Write a protein that binds this ligand. Structure first.
Ligand SMILES: [Cl-]
Ligand SMILES: [Cl-]
Ligand SMILES: [Cl-]
Lengths: 167, 161
């Protein structure tokens, strides 16, 4: 089962992602503080040129369509860590699980890192269950850490260490 | 007993002398610096965006007795991070920075990190009102080993004095 492949996200994929991220609230769920709504070409250009960041389009092996997005950021070669983020299943079997496993393969097997982190807002309980099934562990709840209008959201900080990925 | 004042070039040598090893540099400041600490790194620190650097001044003698910082000051999320804490006095320093954060800057959340072996600092911070949120496992590499960091926080409704 090669169901998806990761390829480098490029300028010709920008409009598609701009269309998928259709509201401010959704932009925040997807990417936190990385961007302002709406997304535009200048923000995405800065993203794909940033140091210590790998940006991926997710390609369906069957159709060759681009069906999502994912990123490995904060790549830190002193502490041997990185952060998965900007996780989007754009359409469609768990494509999300395949995407997570493909990026984890890059992080632990190709880059040889020790620790991979991820943040997810506490109301996204089906994503959280999926991530726990893959092997992520909740480290703690960052209380009221993102402001969204007049309220604050709480973020679960989650991680996997290399001995949880492979023995 | 203490006041916080803007950290300047004339305070750099003193701080460089206080930071005598790489392990201590890491306990104090995490990933901010490379050992040894030097004037070029400090100049960049005092010019960094979203950062307030403080010398801690004894009101009685006017001597500089420590250091503390409020960093990652974030106006969208109304948050900041206390760090670079260097020394009773420790409590006074924390309360002075918390006063700036909550009462002057009107922030909602203040965070802090402390490595899990520093259990006396942890107790002191819990007495002041910080709450443990979670343990970041094996998050700092130090030589051939890893340390674990407690992420702690105070929200504005948990602050009184
Ligand atoms: Cl544009
Ligand atoms: Cl001042
Ligand atoms: Cl810090």
């Amino acid at each position: 089962k090669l169901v998806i492949k990761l390829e480098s996200f490029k300028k010709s994929d920008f409009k598609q992602l701009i269309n998928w991220i259709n509201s401010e609230e959704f932009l925040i769920q997807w990417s936190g503080n990385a961007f302002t709504f709406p997304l535009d070409e200048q923000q995405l250009e800065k993203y794909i040129e940033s140091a210590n960041t790998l940006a991926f389009k997710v390609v369906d092996e069957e159709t060759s369509d681009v069906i999502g997005h994912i990123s490995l950021g904060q790549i830190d070669n002193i502490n041997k860590s990185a952060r998965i983020g900007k996780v989007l299943v754009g359409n469609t079997r768990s494509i999300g699980k395949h995407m997570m496993k493909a990026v984890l393969h890059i992080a632990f097997d190709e880059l040889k890192l020790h620790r991979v982190t991820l943040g997810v807002y506490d109301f996204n309980t089906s994503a959280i269950s999926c991530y726990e099934k893959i092997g992520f562990v909740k480290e703690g709840l960052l209380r009221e850490s993102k402001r969204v209008g007049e309220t604050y959201w709480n973020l679960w900080e989650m991680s996997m260490l290399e001995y949880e990925w492979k023995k």
